[PDB]
Amino acid sequence: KVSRPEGVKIIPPQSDRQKIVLQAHNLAHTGREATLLKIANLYWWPNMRKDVVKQLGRC
DNA sequence: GCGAAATTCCATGACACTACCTTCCCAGGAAACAGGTTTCACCAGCCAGGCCTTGAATGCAATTGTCTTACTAGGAATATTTGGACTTCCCCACCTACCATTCAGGTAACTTGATACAAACACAGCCC
């Protein structure tokens, strides 16, 4: 759990890094930015964008 | 102040109704085919003799062709009478277009099975 100036956001576990982004990627098959703003509704953690790039090279 | 991290930036490309069409490739295999060799047996070509069929000449008989007349029915014009094809309007069921599912058939293979052909000896039918 974490607090942000736009509301309360959620820090997911380290085992739940690839699963939480891949289920947000495949919702609209977006790239780097519209993928990222989906995760900016529930989650937040340091280096979000290092994992989104980790997705798209396999997608 | 450097570095790490979180963020904004901006240059760009693709969407505009789409499939065919042509020529060469590839390809595997197969299709036979076009090419060619090989051999044996048979069908075609050769020629003549005898006979039968065709052609011709003919005389004649009835068949057929023409002429003539009394006439029957065909056609046309009529009125009408009657029998219907197509135009019309509307609705429903049936065919289609579709996907998923499954079954059946075609190819294919291995086996089997059964019949037809080829051969030989004899029988019967028809003809000289």
Side-chain angles (χ1 to χ4, degrees):
Chain A
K1 299 291 184 181
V2 73
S3 180
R4 299 295 294 164
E6 65 181 359
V8 178
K9 299 297 180 186
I10 302 164
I11 294 172
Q14 181 57 254
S15 66
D16 293 331
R17 297 294 175 90
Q18 188 177 4
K19 182 181 74 174
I20 287 177
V21 189
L22 180 64
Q23 68 187 358
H25 167 75
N26 292 321
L27 191 144
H29 278 285
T30 63
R32 199 268 308 277
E33 292 293 328
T35 301
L36 196 72
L37 299 180
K38 294 179 183 178
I39 306 171
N41 309 325
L42 271 69
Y43 293 97
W44 182 72
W45 63 91
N47 292 319
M48 290 173 73
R49 292 180 178 91
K50 291 184 182 178
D51 300 332
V52 179
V53 177
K54 182 69 176 176
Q55 292 286 329
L56 306 181
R58 282 90 173 96
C59 184

